Amino acid sequence: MPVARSWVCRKTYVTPRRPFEKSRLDQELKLIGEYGLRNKREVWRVKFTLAKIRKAARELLTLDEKDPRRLFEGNALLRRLVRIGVLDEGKMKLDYILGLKIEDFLERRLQTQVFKLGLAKSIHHARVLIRQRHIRVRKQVVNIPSFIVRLDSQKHIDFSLRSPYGGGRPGRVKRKNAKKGQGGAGAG
Amino acid sequence: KLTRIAIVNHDKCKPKKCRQECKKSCPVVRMGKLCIEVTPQSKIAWISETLCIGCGICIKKCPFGALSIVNLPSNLEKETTHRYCANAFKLHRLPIPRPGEVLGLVGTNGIGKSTALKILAGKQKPNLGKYDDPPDWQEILTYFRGSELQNYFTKILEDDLKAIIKPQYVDQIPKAAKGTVGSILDRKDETKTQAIVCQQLDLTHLKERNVEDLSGGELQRFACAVVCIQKADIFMFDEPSSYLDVKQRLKAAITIRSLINPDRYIIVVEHDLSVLDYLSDFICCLYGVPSAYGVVTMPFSVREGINIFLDGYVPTENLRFRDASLVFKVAETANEEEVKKMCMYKYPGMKKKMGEFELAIVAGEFTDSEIMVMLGENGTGKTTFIRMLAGRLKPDEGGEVPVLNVSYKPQKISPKSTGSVRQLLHEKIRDAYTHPQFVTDVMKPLQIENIIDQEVQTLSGGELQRVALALCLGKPADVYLIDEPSAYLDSEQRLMAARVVKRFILHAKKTAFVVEHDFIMATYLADRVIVFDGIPSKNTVANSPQTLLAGMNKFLSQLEITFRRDPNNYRPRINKLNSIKDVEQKKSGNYFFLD
Amino acid sequence: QLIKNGKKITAFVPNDGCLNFIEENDEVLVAGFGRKGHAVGDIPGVRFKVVKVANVSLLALYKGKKERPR
Amino acid sequence: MARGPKKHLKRVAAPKHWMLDKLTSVFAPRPSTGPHKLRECLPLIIFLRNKLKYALTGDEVKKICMQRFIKIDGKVRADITYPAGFMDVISIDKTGENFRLIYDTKGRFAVHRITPEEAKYKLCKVRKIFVGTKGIPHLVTHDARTIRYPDPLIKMNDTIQIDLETGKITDFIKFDTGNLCMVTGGANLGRIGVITNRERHPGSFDVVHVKDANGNSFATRLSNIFVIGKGNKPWISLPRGKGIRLTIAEERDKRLAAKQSSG
RNA sequence: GACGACCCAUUCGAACGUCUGCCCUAUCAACUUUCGAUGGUAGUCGCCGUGCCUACCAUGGUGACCACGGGUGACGGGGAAUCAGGGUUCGAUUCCGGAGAGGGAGCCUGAGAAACGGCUACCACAUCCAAGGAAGGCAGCAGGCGCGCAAAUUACCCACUCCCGACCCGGGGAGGUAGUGACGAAAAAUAACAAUACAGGACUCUUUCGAGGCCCUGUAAUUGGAAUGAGUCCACUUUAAAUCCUUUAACGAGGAUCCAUUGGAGGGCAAGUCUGGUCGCAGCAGCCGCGGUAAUUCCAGCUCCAAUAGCGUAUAUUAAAGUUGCUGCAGUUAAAAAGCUCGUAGUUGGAUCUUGUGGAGGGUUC
RNA sequence: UACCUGGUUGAUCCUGCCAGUAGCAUAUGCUUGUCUCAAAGAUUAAGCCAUGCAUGUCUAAGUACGCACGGCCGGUACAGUGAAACUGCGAAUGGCUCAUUAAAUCAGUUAUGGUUCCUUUGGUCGCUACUUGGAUAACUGUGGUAAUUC
C-alpha cells in the first residue's frame, strides 16, 4: 500500500579491509586512549567524514581556475571548514584542505573542550559531566559528547543552572546523608 | 505439534495401473515395517493409522490424486485461557459473542461447555494456565489486545453491560432460594414482562403451589420464566431442553428466540434431536478428550454446522475423524428368540388423586416377556402411575400387589452419603455377569478416574444418573421401573443407556416399565406401548396397552406434530406447522415412516 | 530422504557424541558443508551436514541449554 | 485497468511549483476541470491555505468559500479546487484586498497586491480567429473566452485588454519587434525582455530571441511568448525583481551584503 | 436566481499512426502465400485511416547487416548493489505505463466497460434441500488451510490528507492511529574522583652508598565523600480518545550487584614452546595439516586476543580477476595456428588540389 | 586506499587453479539495558477459502393526504420537522497481484488536414395555452413455497 512515510537513510562509517594489521591496531588504540572514546566505530566515523571532504576538493582541483562551479562550491567548502575552527582564516584555499588530519576534528568535540577549558580534571571525567546533564551551551542543556563546537559558540560553554555545581539544589546522596544524620539524635 | 496421517479415501482407486509406487516410496517401509499393504488385482490399498508419520512423501508420487494428509487432535499447549487445577483439565480457546443473533455450542459431555459460559459472564476469570500469582485484570485485558474481547471485557468490569445465566441443574432452585406461592416471581426486575410470558409459558401452577412442590418439568419452565423477566444485556441458556416434552421444546425455543432484537447477546447449548436448528443462527463445536482437554472451532451457519457434527465428522480446519453419524438405530436389525412359555400379572382399573387433579387407569394385561413404554405430555401425572408399583400408594383398591420382587429408579434424586461411592457396590454382585451391566457403561470410555471411587458430593450429576441406574439394575425382580433415564445424557451414551437395559432384559427373560420424552429411546425399547390423554393437572386417563403402530400414531396425532427421516443418515426431523408433507401425512394417518 | 523431492542424501554429524541425540524416522534440517557442492576434508563423498534435530539445535543440545522433548 | 477518466492525484506526481511538503499526506488536490490546464494553474485551496495562511485545514477553506467572499475575474466562485491561472485577478472584498497571478523569476506564482482601479481589467493572448454563419467573425483567448465582432486588425499571437464588468475588448498590442514580453513556459519561465528577432520554419516550431534590461539574451518556442507592452513600457504593474534572473553567485552576495532574513 | 437541451470553442482525456532503441539459441537456414501472404479497382462494416472483411485482378513480401522457429525461476521504465579508469549483476515491490479477477466465450446499461463487490452458458470445484428446487468466486482489509528454508491483529477513527452525492450537514478496511517486529539505518550507559601503602621515571645534595623529590601506573587486607539514570509512581502536556517522547514533585547504588556476549590462541592472521585427561580411539581441520603413552591443534581449568549490544554459520552475487582482456591476456616446448591453395559477403586501404605583410585584445611573428 | 597471502619440490624459477580477505540480501544459531526512525505470504501453489466489514447520496430551490411528531385556527395551491417510495447522480476512480507478453509491452520524438468526448468555462438560445392525457410505487387488504435482498 501507498503510505505517507519516507525511507531515506545512510551509513556513517566503513570497516577496514585487513582485520589484523599490527601497524593499524595500536595507532587506533592510541587515538581512543588520548581522546577518551568508547569503541573502534567511534574512530571510523571521523575517518569517513574526512575522506568525503578530500574526495570533493580533489574533484574541484581538476576544473579550470575561475570556472563558475569551482568558484561557487570551493568558496562554500572553505567557509564551512573555518566555521568549526578546523582551518585557519589566513590560509583559505583548496590546496590546504589536502593537508588536514583526523586529530584536527577530534579536538573540536564538546568532550575535548570541557576538559581543555578546565571544567573537568580528565578526558574521562568530561564525558560523565556531559552525559549527566551538568553542562550548557549558550542557553541550551546539551547531553551528547560528540557535539562539534562552532567558533562563535566556543566562548559560551558553562554549567547548568539546575545543577548541584552551577548554583542549583543538592543531589539525592547529600540530602539523604544530612536527613539521616539529624535523625541520629532520635525521631528521624 | 499436530499428529498427521495419510488417507486413501478416493473413489475408483486403481492398484491395477498405478505400478504400486506409494508402497515403494514410503520411508517406514524402507526401514522394514508393514506401513503400506497393496498388491496387483487387490481392490484398494490398506494404510496404518499408527505406523505412519506426517511426512507427506507418498502423496507427491501416486499417478492419480488418490492420497492426502489429515491432522488428528493432540495436546498442543497453544492458546490456554484456563486450567481447572494443578496437572488437571485444559480449556484452550474461547468463543466470541455477537449481538442480535443466537450462538449454539455443541459436542460430547464434559468437553468444556459450562466453564466457557462462566468466564464470558465474568463469574469465573481466565488465568492463562498460571497457578502461582494468577493474573488479575491487567495481564488479562493485555493478552487479548488486537481482538474483539479487549473492548468487551472492559464493559463487564465497568458495569456498561451485565449478564444472567440459567442453572445446569434446576433441582437446586427450591433449596437455593425461597418465597411464598406466587411471590417468588412477582418481585423480579420488571412488571410488564411478567404479564406477557403468561401466553407462552404455563403460569397456572406457581399461583397454587410452593417451589419445593414442583416436578423437574415445572422447574425447567420456572427456570426459563424467571430468567426472561430479569434485566440483562447478555443471557446464557445451559440445557433448556432436559425433563421437557416434544411439544414443549418448540414452545421453549419460541420464548427464547423472542429476546434477541434490541442489541442483546445470547448463547445456547443442547444435546437435542430436532430443535437446535430452529433456535440457533450460528454453531460452534467442541473437540478433544473430556477428562483431559477440549478446543473450540470457528463459527458455522446452522445447517452446515449440524452436518459437520452429524453427517460427516470433519471441519474446514482440516482435522476431526470421530462421530460417524451415530443418530439412529442405523443397523435396523432383528434376530432374537421367539418363546411360548409365559407368566401373567393382569390387573383391574382404578380412580385416584395426587391433588386437585383427577386420575384413572383401565383394566388390562401384563406379562413376563416384555418392555412397556409410556407416552403422554408433561403434567399428565404419569410418574405417580409408575409409583403405584412395589405398593407405595393404593396397593389393592384396584391394581394388584406384585407376587414377589420389584426394583425402582426415581426421576428426582438428592444424595446423602459420605467418604466414597465405592462402598455402595455392596448392594449388588458384579463379577458374576460383568457386561453389559457395568464394563460397557460405568467404565466407558477409557476407564476414567472421574467415577471409579469418588464421593457423590464431587461427582457430576450426569454421572450420578449413570451410577444410580447401574446400582438399581443389580437386585433381582420380576419388574423394573424407570423414569427420566435419558436426563443429562449425550447422543452417544443415550444409545448405550437403551442397549444396557434391552440387551440385558431380553436375555434375562424379565420385564420393565419405562418413561421418556426422547423419540429414539421410545421407538427402540418398545414391543407394546401405553398412552395417556386428557387435560394436564386437571383430568387424565391411562389407556389399555397396544401394538406400536396403533399406539404412537394416536400419540403423534394428539400432539399435532409429525416426522420425516432421511435415507443418507437416518436423522429424524420435524415438519413445520403447515406444509405439503404435513397435510399429505395427516390425511393418510401415518406419522412416522420406513419402519 | 528430503521432504519436497523424496530423493536421498548422506550428511555429516558435527562434534563429539552428537550421534546419540539423533534417533531414527524423525526430521532433520540439513545445510551445505561450505564448498558450494564439493566434498570437504578426509570424508569421501559427503556434501552436507546436520544443523537441527526435531526442531532443537545441535549446539543447544551439546552445550546443555535445551533437551529433546519426550 | 483504465475503463474511463481518472479523478485523483498523488502528491509526488503534482506540479513542482506548488511546493507541497513530503510527509503530511499521500494525495494532493486534483484541480477542477476549467479555463486553465492542470499543469499550468494554482488551485484556490493552495492559495488560501498554503500561500496566504487564512486557514489551517481544508475545512477552514470550505467555510470561507461557502460565505461567498471570494471573486475571480469579478465572478463569485464557491468551488475550492477551481483552476485559477496567469493574468487572473482574485478579490477579497471583506478584508479589502486584491491580487493578480504573475510568475516570480524562479518560475512560480508570486503573491502580488494591486490597487482597486487596476483590478478592473485583464490582458488576453489570442489563440484563434474564425468566421461563423451569416459571416459573423469570432475570436478565442488563452483562457477560453469567446468574443463576437472583434476589430479586423486583431490577428494571431496579439494581446487584447478587456474590462471585467462587461467582457468586451477595449484596446490591443500587435506582435512585432521591439515590444515587451514575458516567458510563460520552458526553462526561461518568469523572465521579461523585449522581442528582438523571430526565426520561422515551415512545419515544426518557430523560435523567438529576447533581450533583457541588463543586456542578456535568451530564446524559446513561439508558444511560450506573451506580449505585455507597446515598446519599452508594460500595461501592468510588475512584482519585486522585475524579471531580471540574477545568477547564484550574485544572489549569495546580495544576501550577505543586505543582511535581510533578520541577520 | 435553481434545474434542463440541440450546436460551436475549451478542459480532462481516450484511440489509431511516424522515426530510433532488446536477453540466450544454427544439436533452428530458408520462410509466407484465397485456409489473406504483398499490392491494385469498387464496395461492406466501423467513431474514423487501413486486407478490417467481400468480389475481381496481379505475383508479390522478409533473410547471413541472422529472417522463420525454440527457450526465458521474462511484466517495461524511473531506478538499486558493487565500483581507480573502463565495467559486472539486479529491478515481483509505495511514482508512471500495461495486463487480469478459477479456465475459455457471449452481452445488457451508459459519455465511458467486452465490467466480474453486473448478467448468460459450457468446463473444473463445491454449499443447502421436504429430491421438486435454490444459491457461488478474498491476486480488497483482518483471519484460516495447504505448501515450504521462508513472511504480523478476525484492534480504534473519519480528527489529518483527499475523493463521491441532490450536499457548509451524509459516506470511505482509500487513508490515518495503536499492536507484533535483532529486515535494516542514526544516537548512546554498564564508573568518576580523592586519601593511604607498595611500584616506574625525571631532577637535586653526595666519589659510590643513602636521602629529598615531582608527575604518571596498577592492585590487596581494605578506607572516604560526592554525582547520576535504569526502575517504581502522582500531576501537566500530547491526541478524535489514548499510549510514547519532552517537563516535574516522592522513593531508587559499594560491587559478593542495578553481575555483556559471540568466536578464537601451529601457519595464512591478533593472541600460551602453562597444568590435568585420551592414545590413529574419540574428535579437530575452508586450505596446508593435528592424534599411534612426555598433543603449541582433540576434551577441560587458568591466562590472553579481536569486534561489541551484538557475534557465528549455510546459499546467491560484486570487488580481488590483466583468471573473458574495449582500455588490457594468450597460441616453439606449459591448454592452444585449419594438411594446402583459390574465393563471394564482412573488415581495412598509398601520394596530390590557396599564402605572408598592416591594425585591435595579447605578445615581440599568431 | 589504483594493495594481496597459504598450498605441487631434496631445494629453485614459472604456468595454473584451489583456499583465505571486504561488501551486499534471504534463511538460521547463541545473546540483549535505554531512545528516534521502519521492511514485512513476492520466490513454492495467478493453490483452496468458515465469519465480519470494504459505496453510497437532500438543498431556500423535482414529487409530502405516513395520526409519525406538531401550532392556537383557518388549508387563502399548501405551515412545520419529516420515515417510506418514485425520479436524478455515482458505482468505468481507488485498492490487489505479476499469470500471459521479445519490435509485442515500454522510453524518448512527432501526427490527426484520418476520430470521439459526461462535466467545467465562454459564445448561441423569437421559422386548452391565465396550462393537455392516462397509470403506477409507498400505503390499505387477501395469499403461495422446506428455502433466498423470491
Ligand code: SF4
Ligand atoms: S494409492 Fe495410488 S499408487 Fe498406491 S495403490 Fe492406490 S492408486 Fe496405486
Ligand code: SF4
Ligand atoms: S505420509 Fe510418509 S509415513 Fe505416512 S504413509 Fe505416506 S510415506 Fe508413509
